[PDB]
Write an enzyme that holds these catalytic residues in place. Sequence first.
Site, PDB file in Angstrom:
ATOM      1  CE  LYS A   1      -4.662   0.829   2.088  1.00 11.56           C
ATOM      2  NZ  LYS A   1      -5.077  -0.343   1.059  1.00 11.56           N
TER       3      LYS A   1
ATOM      4  CE  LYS B   1     -21.270   0.542  -5.787  1.00  7.42           C
ATOM      5  NZ  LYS B   1     -20.566   0.096  -7.070  1.00  7.42           N
TER       6      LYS B   1
ATOM      7  N   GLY C   1     -15.185 -18.031  -7.658  1.00 12.25           N
ATOM      8  CA  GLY C   1     -14.126 -18.493  -7.036  1.00 12.25           C
ATOM      9  C   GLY C   1     -12.726 -18.843  -7.768  1.00 12.25           C
TER      10      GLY C   1
HETATM   11  N1  LIG Z   1     -17.142  -5.983 -12.346  1.00 17.08           N
HETATM   12  C1  LIG Z   1     -17.308  -4.737 -11.727  1.00 17.08           C
HETATM   13  O1  LIG Z   1     -17.933  -3.808 -12.250  1.00 17.08           O
HETATM   14  C2  LIG Z   1     -16.670  -4.236 -10.418  1.00 17.08           C
HETATM   15  C3  LIG Z   1     -17.403  -3.115  -9.723  1.00 17.08           C
HETATM   16  N2  LIG Z   1     -16.617  -2.580  -8.448  1.00 17.08           N
HETATM   17  C4  LIG Z   1     -17.101  -1.419  -7.923  1.00 17.08           C
HETATM   18  O2  LIG Z   1     -15.487  -0.525  -8.132  1.00 17.08           O
HETATM   19  C5  LIG Z   1     -15.506   0.475  -7.135  1.00 17.08           C
HETATM   20  C6  LIG Z   1     -14.222   0.215  -6.591  1.00 17.08           C
HETATM   21  O3  LIG Z   1     -14.083  -1.081  -6.228  1.00 17.08           O
HETATM   22  P1  LIG Z   1     -12.680  -1.791  -5.808  1.00 17.08           P
HETATM   23  O4  LIG Z   1     -11.544  -1.235  -7.046  1.00 17.08           O
HETATM   24  O5  LIG Z   1     -12.484  -3.256  -5.849  1.00 17.08           O
HETATM   25  O6  LIG Z   1     -12.489  -1.321  -4.301  1.00 17.08           O
HETATM   26  P2  LIG Z   1     -11.306  -1.672  -3.253  1.00 17.08           P
HETATM   27  O7  LIG Z   1     -11.418  -3.190  -2.755  1.00 17.08           O
HETATM   28  O8  LIG Z   1      -9.938  -2.053  -4.243  1.00 17.08           O
HETATM   29  O9  LIG Z   1     -10.967  -0.728  -2.114  1.00 17.08           O
HETATM   30  C7  LIG Z   1     -10.446   0.575  -2.852  1.00 17.08           C
HETATM   31  C8  LIG Z   1      -9.990   1.380  -1.543  1.00 17.08           C
HETATM   32  O10 LIG Z   1     -11.014   1.693  -0.814  1.00 17.08           O
HETATM   33  C9  LIG Z   1     -10.584   2.571   0.518  1.00 17.08           C
HETATM   34  N3  LIG Z   1     -11.364   1.728   1.478  1.00 17.08           N
HETATM   35  C10 LIG Z   1     -11.900   0.458   1.409  1.00 17.08           C
HETATM   36  N4  LIG Z   1     -12.690   0.440   2.582  1.00 17.08           N
HETATM   37  C11 LIG Z   1     -12.553   1.621   3.222  1.00 17.08           C
HETATM   38  C12 LIG Z   1     -12.969   1.778   4.447  1.00 17.08           C
HETATM   39  N5  LIG Z   1     -14.053   1.380   5.384  1.00 17.08           N
HETATM   40  N6  LIG Z   1     -12.925   3.353   5.003  1.00 17.08           N
HETATM   41  C13 LIG Z   1     -12.171   4.013   4.174  1.00 17.08           C
HETATM   42  N7  LIG Z   1     -11.512   3.597   3.077  1.00 17.08           N
HETATM   43  C14 LIG Z   1     -11.705   2.227   2.506  1.00 17.08           C
HETATM   44  C15 LIG Z   1      -9.288   2.099   0.454  1.00 17.08           C
HETATM   45  O11 LIG Z   1      -8.708   3.429  -0.066  1.00 17.08           O
HETATM   46  P3  LIG Z   1      -6.877   3.670   0.205  1.00 17.08           P
HETATM   47  O12 LIG Z   1      -6.158   3.496  -1.250  1.00 17.08           O
HETATM   48  O13 LIG Z   1      -6.986   5.223   0.606  1.00 17.08           O
HETATM   49  O14 LIG Z   1      -6.587   2.985   1.138  1.00 17.08           O
HETATM   50  C16 LIG Z   1      -9.149   0.767  -0.467  1.00 17.08           C
HETATM   51  O15 LIG Z   1      -7.646   0.984  -0.807  1.00 17.08           O
HETATM   52  C17 LIG Z   1     -16.534   0.087  -6.144  1.00 17.08           C
HETATM   53  O16 LIG Z   1     -17.575   0.890  -6.132  1.00 17.08           O
HETATM   54  C18 LIG Z   1     -17.017  -1.419  -6.678  1.00 17.08           C
HETATM   55  O17 LIG Z   1     -18.489  -1.664  -6.241  1.00 17.08           O
HETATM   56  C19 LIG Z   1     -15.488  -3.258  -7.915  1.00 17.08           C
HETATM   57  C20 LIG Z   1     -15.182  -4.711  -8.273  1.00 17.08           C
HETATM   58  C21 LIG Z   1     -15.701  -5.368  -9.798  1.00 17.08           C
HETATM   59  C1  LIG Z   2     -14.805 -14.586  -9.681  1.00 13.08           C
HETATM   60  O1  LIG Z   2     -15.758 -15.295  -8.539  1.00 13.08           O
HETATM   61  C2  LIG Z   2     -16.188 -14.081  -7.864  1.00 13.08           C
HETATM   62  C3  LIG Z   2     -15.990 -12.865  -8.182  1.00 13.08           C
HETATM   63  C4  LIG Z   2     -16.637 -11.899  -7.186  1.00 13.08           C
HETATM   64  C5  LIG Z   2     -16.754 -10.639  -7.822  1.00 13.08           C
HETATM   65  C6  LIG Z   2     -17.553  -9.673  -7.022  1.00 13.08           C
HETATM   66  C7  LIG Z   2     -18.630  -9.936  -8.138  1.00 13.08           C
HETATM   67  O2  LIG Z   2     -19.731  -9.226  -8.092  1.00 13.08           O
HETATM   68  C8  LIG Z   2     -18.665  -7.943  -8.345  1.00 13.08           C
HETATM   69  C9  LIG Z   2     -19.187  -6.833  -8.578  1.00 13.08           C
HETATM   70  C10 LIG Z   2     -19.427  -5.849  -7.591  1.00 13.08           C
HETATM   71  C11 LIG Z   2     -20.164  -4.511  -7.670  1.00 13.08           C
HETATM   72  C12 LIG Z   2     -20.526  -4.258  -9.066  1.00 13.08           C
HETATM   73  O3  LIG Z   2     -21.137  -3.356  -9.285  1.00 13.08           O
HETATM   74  C13 LIG Z   2     -20.481  -5.110 -10.122  1.00 13.08           C
HETATM   75  O4  LIG Z   2     -20.839  -4.923 -11.119  1.00 13.08           O
HETATM   76  C14 LIG Z   2     -20.469  -5.841 -12.143  1.00 13.08           C
HETATM   77  C15 LIG Z   2     -19.789  -6.539  -9.691  1.00 13.08           C
HETATM   78  C16 LIG Z   2     -18.027  -8.142  -7.156  1.00 13.08           C
HETATM   79  C17 LIG Z   2     -16.557  -7.435  -7.038  1.00 13.08           C
HETATM   80  O5  LIG Z   2     -15.805  -7.634  -6.018  1.00 13.08           O
HETATM   81  C18 LIG Z   2     -17.516 -12.320  -6.230  1.00 13.08           C
HETATM   82  C19 LIG Z   2     -17.403 -13.717  -5.960  1.00 13.08           C
HETATM   83  C20 LIG Z   2     -16.877 -14.798  -6.812  1.00 13.08           C
HETATM   84  O6  LIG Z   2     -16.543 -15.990  -6.467  1.00 13.08           O
END
Ligand SMILES: NC(=O)C1=CN([C@@H]2O[C@H](COP(=O)(O)OP(=O)(O)OC[C@H]3O[C@@H](n4cnc5c(N)ncnc54)[C@H](OP(=O)(O)O)[C@@H]3O)[C@@H](O)[C@H]2O)C=CC1
Ligand SMILES: COc1cc(C[C@@H]2CO[C@@H](c3ccc(O)c(OC)c3)[C@@H]2CO)ccc1O
Lengths: 286, 287
Positions: free
Chosen positions: A43, A121, A155
Amino acid sequence: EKTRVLVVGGTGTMGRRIVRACLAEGHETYVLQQPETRVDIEKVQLLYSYKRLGARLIEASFSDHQSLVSAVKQVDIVVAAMSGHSILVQLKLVEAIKEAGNIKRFLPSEFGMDPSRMDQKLEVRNAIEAAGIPHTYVVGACFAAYFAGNLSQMGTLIPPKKKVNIYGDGNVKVVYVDEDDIAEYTAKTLDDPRTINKTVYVRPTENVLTQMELVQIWEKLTGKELEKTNISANDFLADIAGLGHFYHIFYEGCLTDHEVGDDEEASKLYPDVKYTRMDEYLKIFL
Amino acid sequence: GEKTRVLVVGGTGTMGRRIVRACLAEGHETYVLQQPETRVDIEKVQLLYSYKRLGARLIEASFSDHQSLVSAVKQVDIVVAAMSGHSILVQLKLVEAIKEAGNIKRFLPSEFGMDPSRMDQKLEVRNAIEAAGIPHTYVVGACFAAYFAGNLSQMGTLIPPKKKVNIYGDGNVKVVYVDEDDIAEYTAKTLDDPRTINKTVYVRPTENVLTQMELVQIWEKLTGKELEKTNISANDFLADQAGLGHFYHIFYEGCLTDHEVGDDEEASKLYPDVKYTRMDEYLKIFL
Ligand SMILES: NC(=O)C1=CN([C@@H]2O[C@H](COP(=O)(O)OP(=O)(O)OC[C@H]3O[C@@H](n4cnc5c(N)ncnc54)[C@H](OP(=O)(O)O)[C@@H]3O)[C@@H](O)[C@H]2O)C=CC1
Ligand SMILES: COc1cc(C[C@@H]2CO[C@@H](c3ccc(O)c(OC)c3)[C@@H]2CO)ccc1O
Ligand SMILES: NC(=O)C1=CN([C@@H]2O[C@H](COP(=O)(O)OP(=O)(O)OC[C@H]3O[C@@H](n4cnc5c(N)ncnc54)[C@H](OP(=O)(O)O)[C@@H]3O)[C@@H](O)[C@H]2O)C=CC1
Ligand SMILES: COc1cc(C[C@@H]2CO[C@@H](c3ccc(O)c(OC)c3)[C@@H]2CO)ccc1O
């Protein structure tokens, strides 16, 4: 001259790519530096690596309302990318922005399924709109790392070797987008006068694919047919929120069931983004 | 002669990822161990596959599958491990595999810290390497600059403190502070150097042998501000928990510097073209 951007959550999966994309766009880029919670070697190194690229660090804490105000007063735009409890911390960010008064645009942590469909959200959206903070909601795609590289199997994050579950008949359209492309679209839209107070759908045309089309892209790259097991809807609801996520994407088709106009879809707004197609994306696994 | 094929074990670890990139930089045909996923670990997977873009190959293997370790090592001339620190003891399985394969010209076990033979499961791993007759190099003797320099040797943080700082003892014990990148580059240079076969290599870049109080002064001169220092007796320190003790050996016993090392066993002299990062340059990133 440059738009000044604060990236909140800059060390996360999406946030780090947004930091880089803002720099690559030419934005003067600031990254929120939160008080360490632990000896976290990668980090800290990720954060400080941004300075070498020209980013600046801004120290503030979500528990410290005045430090958030001080932070956002130093920039023009705020982009948040918190994990998704952590979504709701943005409420503190909204009040800070509302007090500061100088923010031209706020992009909250969206980057997935549209939460306005019939959710923390949505609660953030309402606070944004209540405060009169101009906004852009970036939505509509599956991260390729979470959904394409594993051929949408749960998974795991890499292609399966012999077998694959197909959801329903696997003919529901999905949107598979490289996370780097999502970030670059985000950097380009965040000061675009066309996307002020709009939802931007990241739906690059050639990446709108059914699960079966994804699997068949892979099968053609490898030359190996996978053993497919179809899983019916109800067979999928044996669960007594992440099964819910897959169910909305692959059974309800929530990413593709409404059409989007060119004026609100990223690849049409920014046709210079040569987005990664899924056949190219999957090549790294061969 | 030719590349020299290297397998890195623990390739997504702090040291392992630097070692992967160093081996590629040195021109080695570089292989990384791909262990079965234990979880949805996005940053671990992306790190592993990023190595492919740089020219590395991945080899899937499991420590609980003796035959997969054998097959992996049979494809390389040299093995380098950098496991966290049980983590250490899993290398025993790797030694058994190296033993059976019989093609490995050298093995560098997961060292990169205090020399355990001067104080351990690291020693256990050494015994197995040697009993098996596997040529080896042990890379020892330096504090990672990220863990001990960027925080001015304060515990519980990795960045410089804002106004006050603890001084261990009188802060006049010599410590060796080295950029992890330089450790990794010395490791990639030494792993096929005939001068270091079956030897311990000490990473002790001369200009980086510093007392804590010297480290503090480098920073005070960079910031132009003096820090409020409070000294801490050995006995105080030892008022009762393994992290502590690591620190004690280092900053009170001086375990990194209480013995001389010769130029034919010291990395900066063996490899003088490595312009190692001095601590004044290292700390500038924090300003
Ligand atoms: N397939 C898709 O479309 C996906 C959608 N998303 C969405 O994208 C967005 C970001 O997801 P993702 O990149 O995985 O996020 P992360 O799990 O990678 O977390 C990102 C940052 O959020 C900060 N954070 C987490 N928890 C806290 C907390 N309690 N308090 C303060 N800061 C916190 C930290 O910031 P810091 O850097 O400052 O330490 C952390 O590094 C989300 O809204 C998620 O729903 C994410 C996964 C898949
Ligand atoms: C690939 O296997 C997995 C993958 C995930 C990914 C999770 C999937 O649903 C994802 C997600 C969260 C917020 C979103 O808006 C989203 O939009 C697609 C998807 C989660 C991102 O961490 C969760 C459980 C699993 O077993
Ligand atoms: N001040 C100093 O000099 C320091 C010394 N060191 C020493 O450097 C060496 C490596 O340390 P470091 O880089 O921080 O270690 P890391 O914790 O960063 O190494 C993690 C990697 O080791 C593998 N690993 C950990 N546990 C297991 C397990 N049960 N089974 C299989 N694999 C496992 C994994 O390999 P994979 O990537 O394949 O998943 C993991 O990614 C150690 O000997 C350590 O003592 C390290 C810290 C500071
Ligand atoms: C920076 O704050 C801490 C830093 C550490 C670093 C730990 C320090 O002792 C380090 C170490 C382990 C093995 C070694 O051979 C070593 O040689 C110096 C050092 C540990 C590396 O993970 C442990 C506890 C802390 O509070």
